Amino acid sequence: FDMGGYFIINGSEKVLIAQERSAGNIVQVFKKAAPSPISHVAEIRSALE
Amino acid sequence: EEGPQVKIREASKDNVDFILSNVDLAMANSLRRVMIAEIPTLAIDSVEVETNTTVLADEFIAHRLGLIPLQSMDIEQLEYSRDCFCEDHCDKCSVVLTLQAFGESESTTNVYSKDLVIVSNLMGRNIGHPIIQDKEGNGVLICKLRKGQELKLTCVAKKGIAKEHAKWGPAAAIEFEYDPWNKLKHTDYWYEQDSAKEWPQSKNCEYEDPPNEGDPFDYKAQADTFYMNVESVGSIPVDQVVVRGIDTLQKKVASILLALTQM
Amino acid sequence: PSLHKMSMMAHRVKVIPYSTFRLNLSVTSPYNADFDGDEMNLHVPQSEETRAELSQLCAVPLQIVSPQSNKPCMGIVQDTLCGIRKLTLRDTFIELDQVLNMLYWVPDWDGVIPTPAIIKPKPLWSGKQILSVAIPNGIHLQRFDEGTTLLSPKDNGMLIIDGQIIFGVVEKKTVGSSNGGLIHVVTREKGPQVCAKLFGNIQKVVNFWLLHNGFSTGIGDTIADGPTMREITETIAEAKKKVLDVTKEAQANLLTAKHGMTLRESFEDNVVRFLNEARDKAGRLAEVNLKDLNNVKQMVMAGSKGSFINIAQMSACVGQQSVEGKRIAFGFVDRTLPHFSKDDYSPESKGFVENSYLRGLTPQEFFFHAMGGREGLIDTAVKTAETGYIQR
Amino acid sequence: TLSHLRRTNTPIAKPRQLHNTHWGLVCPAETPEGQACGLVKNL
Amino acid sequence: ASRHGQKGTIGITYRREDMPFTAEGIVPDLIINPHAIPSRMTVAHLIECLLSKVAALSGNEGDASPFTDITVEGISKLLREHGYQSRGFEVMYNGHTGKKLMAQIFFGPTYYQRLRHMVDDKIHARARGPMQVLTRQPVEGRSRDGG
Amino acid sequence: MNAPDRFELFLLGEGESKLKIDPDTKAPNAVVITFEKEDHTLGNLIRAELLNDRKVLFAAYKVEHPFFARFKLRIQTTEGYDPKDALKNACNSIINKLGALKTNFETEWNLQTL
Amino acid sequence: SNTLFDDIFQVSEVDPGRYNKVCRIEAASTTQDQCKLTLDINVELFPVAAQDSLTVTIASSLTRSWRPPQAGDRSLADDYDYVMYGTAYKFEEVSKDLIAVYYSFGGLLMRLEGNYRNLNNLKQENAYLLIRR
Amino acid sequence: MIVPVRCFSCGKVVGDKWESYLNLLQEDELDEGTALSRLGLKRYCCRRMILTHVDLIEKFLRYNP
Amino acid sequence: RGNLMGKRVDFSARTVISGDPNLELDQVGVPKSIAKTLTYPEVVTPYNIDRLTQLV
Amino acid sequence: DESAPITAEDSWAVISAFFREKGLVSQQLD
Amino acid sequence: FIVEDDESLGHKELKVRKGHIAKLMATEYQDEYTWSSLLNEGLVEYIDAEEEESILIAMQPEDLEPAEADVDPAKRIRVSHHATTFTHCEIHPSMILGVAASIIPFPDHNQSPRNTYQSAMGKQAMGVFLTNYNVRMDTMANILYYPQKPLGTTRAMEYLKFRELPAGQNAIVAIACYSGY
RNA sequence: AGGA
Ligand SMILES: [Mg+2]
Ligand SMILES: [Zn+2]
Ligand SMILES: [Zn+2]
């Protein structure tokens, strides 16, 4: 029945928890809040594969 | 014939269906309780484990051992160990059972209530025999072993009652009904449209006269006539589950009469 | 947490078996405890002086009427509240056998078997009568509910004269942690110890009577009439068309916005208001269609647990789901789920759960209810820490 | 054990809420109550 | 707890002769309060029961699957075919007296889970004991015999 | 761990009597018997049988708390009639009734073929 | 220690408003035109239909605890088929020479409207209610 | 994990009836509802005992010492 | 805040709570084990002298 | 009719095949 | 599932047909037609959230495919197959659920959070966690004595091995007011 | 890492 997907480290069964992140290389436009000189921003979180 | 009357409807090794009439509900119920709780039986109570190479734990097995029904016919001539005079136990107060099993076979080896052996001297009384009702004659399946799986243990079956542990329960379910037509108005039927259609009739509806709508409510009416069914587990025969129940309750009331007398 | 002076009260020890602290149920509320696995702390004084502080200032009976809200902070709950209604109806009569037991059960009982309300044919006592054995003399109470007269046709309100119930069914309003309450009057008139005795005395007779009468609740109590279900479906059906009509009216530029509101803001206000008016009518249909024998209605009537909305949601219609006040929004471009067409302002697209819990929710209805559900859990988890700091 | 091998963590506009986009990908009910509510997703 | 966020601890334990019984000699293993149900609107718990009661009698795995064509009215028809009253209620009798309960009890099987949290692992009491070294104040936690 | 012994349910304690009769102060010719290591089986049975006695004016019983197998039985009788006697009589009549029940079941069983 | 009111009434209406075992009755005195009656009756014990002739009596007697049997030999002050015991709670002055008394028999209420029984009906816990036919 | 001796609810021996039940299904081919009933398991408390059992013991036996 | 306004304290106990319809409002059911642990310092006075000698 | 439309119960035979191949920790492994 | 207008014989219908179902179940009895078999045949596709934006899904196939040309009251109120645009169909809606929720019987009949609670408690329920329990040395382990498979089950449990390794017992339950305990 |  034991499915696997875990590691045995110095005896203990360790699970690597999936860590959520925002996708890279993505064009996103956001309205910048009423007290700001900048009204709107275009962002790109560019990083190499 | 005298006071409260019985009329047996169906009898067997395991079950007694009957009608009890000219009795108070209090008395039928008191007897109902007594049968479940206070009739003495013999059951495995101490288990010394010599070797256990099984997949089951010592105490898991020990527990199952207590639940194995034992012949308690002559339980009346066995003393309650607590009342007995020996340092722990003896033949006067206990039945010694031995269970030795081993996986000789390549196939799974089964350990049954039949595999029990009496090592104590019985004094020729009917007691401690594992109850086998099983068709193939094996009784309860205690354990399973593969190969070098050995089971060696000794049992001390002692006299007891269900109040102390439900293992000394001489009866299984006790069926109990009165007034199948709600003539006494002892229940208020939950319904959506009609309580007559929604609530099924019982067997006992036949054994009693239907109320006939065009009649006033019998407030005068009290509850007598009780359709019961005592199911034995095998420790004691069904008749005795009833008889002993009557006797135990009698002896119980007797104690009160005597207690007043000592005072 | 200990957000009250009543979250820490002084009690009498009773040494008992089994590993749990045992508490009287009426003292549950001040602590805010329940038995779903709660744990409580016990502190033992060491000085004769220290004990005097506990017994004389912070003991449970003294804590009955709280200054927090100038009303009693303890009352009759659950079984005892549920049973107290059942026991005090005009229909409820008790035979001698049980009356004598119920009487013996009151520890401070005068030893005087009261005269039955009905002497021949058959001596029968009423619930009202034998409950009054717990009500001490000199206790005068009067309450007029809607439609109550001195002849109380509906067995409405309350009239207790010399600690004897004259008329009305006893429930939340009477024997609960209420302002004019039987508890509030007793404390103020008889004392804190006399009232604390009354607490037990009610729950000994009531619980005993309820033990023997019994009370249950099942799926049968959630189902409403075959024709009342037809009537509920058609109530939603007509309300759905009332929406479609406003939808087509706004699509044809004929809609005229309320001053200081978008044309859309105005539209949604109507749609939401229609679907909510609908969820209620559908509910109010069932709460009427469920007989006095409905175990749920019975719990609602006593004030022990449940309210209209619970019946409505279980029996009739769950209703419109909301997130941030607005209906379920277009998380996907111009739609709520990929199972829908674009620019769908319909009840079904924006989170209206047409179905009852009894009937079951559709995959969409389920997910939208889930979104709406998760919102509650977020604030519940947030509020918990935010609220704590305010207290501090 | 099964549900621990399908767990998701979200560290740090309105993350805790159940989004339309979570349909078919993340469980609408399996989430802790408390500081982790809606931040710890289950696949 | 059941599989419906319907958690609780034990209050008391009763033997069979105190427990309320069906005319059929059946007694509950567990007694839960009516009060849980209305405020919680955990309808599926009631259906779990009705469906499981049919399943136990019929000897067929009860399909309590989510989006299906199963109805309480359907399950009710099957239970009525088995002799019990359609909505699961059963006339029960008081265990102490033997007298019928005026109320019929919603009685049938329900899958209940034994949870990690047990009283004897929780219970703790101290009355003087180990002290910190720095603060010379009582130590932390039940294990350490803390205050 | 805090669980009592199972035999405490039925086995009398150290210097503990089955019956303990205390007189009822509140009412004349009334008494209170506390039955130790006893329960509903015998409580409700005695209560019900005393109800059948005409000279018994009051009869009730209570198991004050379930953790303990004991019950208080209150008996009030007409002046001159002793409540202890009332208990003795209803006690006796119960046995006499059971004697008939046993005899009648034994005759009915001895008539069966199974 | 004696009777307090005697008359015979005719039931106009019988009412069980969600009440399985009890009904509120509406009657009027065949003798006095001024006299009317409202009363809750255990209809399971003694049932009542409209247009029944019922002798309704009051009486302050026939205190302390209550004794059940021996009544075989005891003089049962009932020549009536249904008897109740309750308390007077309100004394309504319904104008002129007219008066109305309210009786509660453990929840089972009663309102009697008349005139003459001024030197009769009192604010007493002692108030029996006897009914025949 | 290994057949329960005696049904929790009523306490009727259920220990003997396992192999017999498993056989009324393989060899006799019968449906679960009839098999139980043949074995005299009337009340649903008794029926659920066998009908819902998961004889894990067999899996445990598959390991060596 | 942690060592002065608050403190870990002796003569304190804690367990799971459960309700009782047979307890009085102002009472608290204490497990035997918890009573057997927690202690009250009673000064030997002529009133208590004999009781205390037996408890001892 | 080896090319007839699929029913409601049929989707389960597909779900069976999904876990038959992918298992339950498909994600962690791959 | 993929839905194609591409059906000479009538309407817009699901690529997968009753023949593939039998072809899969032929392999199910063998324990040569895998999940990969449907994937490479192009009857089923993998749709991430971004792609999902441009598609249109049917919940049920049969119920949401051929249009109209009486109705049971006890069943829930459902919508329709109005669209002729359906690019895809939902395998089974109950698949939106994760491991824990999938053990909840009739979750479509519970208030939203009552389900969120069971998907937290089942993780603290005792049962058989693995059959090798007796052979492993773990700091703390709880095994239920006599586990039972649930009487009421989810079609989803099959793949979760729940009926093989349970977390509880089927208790005979009364919902009653008894001693008030 | 969990419990109210
Ligand atoms: Mg809680
Ligand atoms: Zn001996
Ligand atoms: Zn059973």
Q: Chain E window 77-136: which residues touch I at a Cβ cutoff of 8 Å?
A: 119, 122-129, 135
Nearest to C121 by CA among B216, G3, B219, G103: B219
**CA K143 from centre of chain:** 27
DSSP states along D2-39 = TTTTTEEE-----TTS--GGGTTTS-SS---SSTTTTT
Q: Say which DSSP state B115 is in.
A: G
Residue B208 contacts E, CB cutoff 8 Å: no
Tokens representing residue K17 in the block: 């047909």
Amino acid in position K126? M
Distance between Cα C36 and ligand 1 center (Å):
5
As a whole number of Å, the CA-based R_g of chain G is: 15
Q: Confirm whether any atom of chain L, the nucleic acid strand, is less than 7 Å from CB of C385.
A: no
Burial class for K42, CB neighbours closer than 10 Å (0-12, 13-18, 19+)? exposed
Question: Within chain A, how many helices (H) and strands (E) appear?
Answer: 0, 5
Q: Which tokens hold the place of B188?
A: 């208020």
Beta bridge partners of F74: F32, F60
**Measured CA angle at D12 (ends D10, D17), to 5 deg:** 60
Q: Which ligand is nearest to the CA of H11?
A: 3
Interface test with D, best of A6, A12, A16, A17 (most D CBs within 10 A): A17
Measured CA to CA, the distance from residue K14 to residue K90 in angstroms comes to 10
The SS3 call for residue E93 is: strand
D34 CA to L2 C1' distance (Å): 11
Residue of K nearest to H6 (CA): K146
Domain extent listing, chain F: 1-114
Ligand nearest to the CA of B83: 2
Least Cα separation, residue H56 to chain E (angstroms)? 18
Q: Which ligand is nearest to the CA of I16?
A: 1
Domains in chain H, please, with CATH?
Answer: 1-65 (1.10.10.60)
CB-neighbour burial class of residue C385 (10 A; exposed 0-12, middle 13-18, buried 19+): exposed
Helix (H) or strand (E) segment spanning residue I12 = strand I12-19
- Give the number of beta-carbon pairs within 8 Å between B and E: 71
- Residue numbers in J near A4 (CB within 8 A): 25, 28-29
d(CA B2, ligand 1 centre) in Å: 58
Contact by Cβ (8 Å): F18, B177? no
| Residues of chain I numbered 1-40 and touching chain F (CB < 8 Å) | 22, 31-33
Instruction: Note the CATH number of domain B1-40+167-263.
Output: 3.30.1360.10
User: Which helix H or strand E contains E6, and what residues bound it?
Assistant: none
Buried (b) or exposed (e) across G69-93, using 16+ Cβ within 10 A?
A: eeeeeeeebbebebbbbbbbbeeee
Q: Is the separation of the CB atoms in D33 and C344 below 8 Å?
A: no
Q: How far does I28 lie from chain E, in Å, by closest CA?
A: 15
d(CA C114, CA C309): 42
Using CA atoms, how far residue G60 sits from C1, D23, G74, G130, K42, in Å, is 60, 78, 18, 11, 97
Residue B126 token pair: 């009917």
SS (H, E, C) chain G: CCCCCEEEEEEEEEECCCCCCEEEEEEEECCCCCCEEEEEEECCCCCCCCCCEEEEECCCCCCCCCCCCCCCCCCCCCCCCEEEECEEEEEECCCCCCEEEEEEECCEEEEEEECCHHHCCCCCCCCEEEEEC
CA distances from A34 to A37, A39, B161 (A): 9, 8, 82
The rounded Å distance from CA B64 to ligand 3 centre is 16
Query: What does the alpha-carbon distance between residue E17 and residue B171 come to, in Å, rounded to a whole number?
Result: 12
Q: Which of H8, H11, H51 is closest, CB to CB, to E59? A: H51
How many Å from the CA of A21 to C1' of L1?
24
SS3 K109: helix
- Taking the CA of residue I22 and the nearest CA in chain K, the distance in Å comes to 9
**G54 pairs with which residues across the strands?**
G9
Count of Cβ atoms closer than 10 Å to residue K28 Cβ: 12
Count of residues for chain C? 392
Virtual torsion, Cα B190, B195, B201, B206, nearest 10 deg: 130
Residues 13-42 of D with CB under 7 A from strand L: 32, 34
Domain boundaries, chain B: 1-40+167-263, 41-166
Report all structural domains of chain G as residue ranges with CATH numbers, in order of start.
1-133 (2.40.50.140)
On whether the CB atoms of residues C285 and C229 are closer than 8 A, the answer is no
E13 at B interface, C-beta within 8 A:
no
- H neighbours by CB contacts (3+ pairs under 8 Å): B, E, K
Cis check for the bond before C153: say yes or no (omega within 30 of 0).
no
Residue G10 burial (10 A CB sphere; 0-12, 13-18, 19+):
middle
Check CB contact of J7 with chain D, cutoff 8 Å.
no
Which of K97, K125, K171 faces E109 most closely, judged by CB atoms?
K171
Instruction: Return d(Cα B175, Cα E49) in angstroms, integer.
Output: 23
- The Cα of E125 is separated from the nearest Cα of chain I by a number of Å equal to 4
Nucleotide nearest to D7 (CA to C1'): L1
Through-space separation of residue K124 CA and nucleotide L2 C1' in angstroms: 9
Cα–Cα nearest to B207, from B177, B238, B235: B177
**Contact: E100, B26; criterion CB under 8 Å:** no
Give dist(CA C143, CA C158) in Å, integer: 5
CA E114-E117-E123 angle, to 5 degrees, is: 135
**What is the spatial distance between Cα H6 and Cα K171, in angstroms, rounded to a whole number?**
15
D4: the nucleotide nearest its CA (via C1') is: L1
CATH of domain F1-114: 3.30.1360.10
Q: Three-class SS of residue E125? A: strand
Residue nearest to nucleotide L2 (CA to C1'): K124
| Residues 6 or more apart in contact with residue D19 via CB below 8 angstroms | C331, C371
Q: Quick one: B41-166 is in which CATH superfamily?
A: DNA-directed RNA polymerase, insert domain (2.170.120.12)
**Alpha-carbon span D16 to D18, nearest angstrom:** 7
Nearest in space to B134 (alpha carbons), one of B257, B255, B14:
B14
Chains D and B touch (3+ CB pairs under 8 A): no
CB of B114 within 8 Å of any CB in chain H? no
- Supply φ then ψ for residue C79, to 5 degrees: -45, -55
Structure tokens at C320: 């419109």
B140: Cα separation from own chain's centroid: 16
List of chain K residues whose C-beta atoms are within 8 Å of the C-beta of residue H45: 172
Helix (H, G, I), strand (E, B) or coil at D42: strand
Contact E34 C212 (CB under 8 A): no
CA of A26 vs chain D CAs: smallest distance (Å): 17
Helix, strand, coil percentages (3-state) for chain F, rounded to 5, are 40, 25, 40
Please state how this structure was obtained: X-ray
User: SS3 of C295, please?
Assistant: helix
CB-CB under 8 Å, C380 with D23:
no
G125 lies within 8 A of chain B by CB: no
Tokens of J16: 């069976």
Query: Among all residues of chain E, which has the CA nearest to that of C318?
Result: E41
Distance A4 CA to L2 C1' (A): 24
For C78-213, which CATH superfamily applies? RNA polymerase Rpb1, domain 3 (1.10.274.100)
Report the SS3 class of residue H40: coil
CA distance K98 to H4: 33
* Cα–Cα distance measured from residue B60 to residue K145, given in angstroms and rounded to the nearest whole number: 8
Residue numbers in K near A1 (CB within 8 A): 130-131, 161, 164-165
Q: Give the residue with minimal CA–C1' separation from L4.
A: C38
**B119 reaches H (C-beta below 8 A):** no
| Chain E residues 103 to 132 with C-beta below 7 Å from nucleic strand L | 116-117
Alpha helices in chain B (DSSP H): 25-37, 58-67, 195-198, 238-262
Distance K117 CA to L4 C1' (A): 14
Q: Strand L closer than 7 Å to the CB of C34?
A: yes
Using left for φ > 0, alpha for ψ between -120 and 50, and beta otherwise, residue A34 falls in alpha
Other C-beta atoms lying within 10 Å of the C-beta of residue H27: 8
CB contact burial C90-119 (16+ within 10 A = b; e otherwise)? bbbbbebbbbbbbbbbbeebebebbbbbbb
Closest to K155 measured CA to CA, from E67, C345, E52, B25: E67
